[PDB]
């Protein structure tokens, strides 16, 4: 479905599935490889699955239970995300565990460093929780 890149607003790096283990989700400088492209499938009511182009793995969280600092990971099963415009800047998006306050978060204050882990964390104003979803 609609294939998109997902760039962190604060870090400037792409949501990337580690090319070596195909499991760890981290920020990496955008190069346009399939591991940085994500198939957004609309389930309904602006709920989505987000499926890596490289592996077919779905964006999810380790062990499925949302909490502060639970890391993002690739799953063989679908995991549902709410995707909506940020409240302060309508031009960017949040990607969240549905009906929870746990938002997809670029760790270490949205560090631009390649390999910066992506996780979920309680919703804050931080642009490290804001993403640009755009075609590629």
Author numbering: 3 to 138
What does the paper say about this structure?
CCP1 crystallized in P21 space group with two molecules in the asymmetric unit. CCP1 has a β-trefoil fold, consisting of only β-strands. The fold resembles a tree with a six-stranded β-barrel as a stem and additional three pairs of β-strands and connecting loops as the tree crown. The three-dimensional structure of cocaprin 1 showed similarity to fungal β-trefoil lectins. Based on the crystal structure, we designed mutations in the surface exposed loops, which were of sufficient length to be able to inhibit aspartic and cysteine proteases. Equilibrium constants were determined for the inhibition of papain and pepsin, which indicated that the β2-β3 loop containing the N22R mutation was involved in papain inhibition because this mutant had an approximately ten-fold higher Ki value. Since the same mutant had a Ki value for pepsin inhibition comparable to that of the wild type CCP1, this suggests that the inhibitory reactive sites for aspartic and cysteine proteases are located at different positions on the protein. Only the N22 mutation in CCP1 significantly reduced its ability to inhibit cysteine proteases, suggesting that the β2-β3 loop is critical for inhibition, which is different from that of clitocypin. The corresponding loop in CCP1 is much shorter and consists of only five residues (Val99-Ala103). It makes a rather tight turn between β strands β9 and β10 and does not protrude from the globular core of the protein, so it is unlikely to be involved in aspartic protease inhibition.
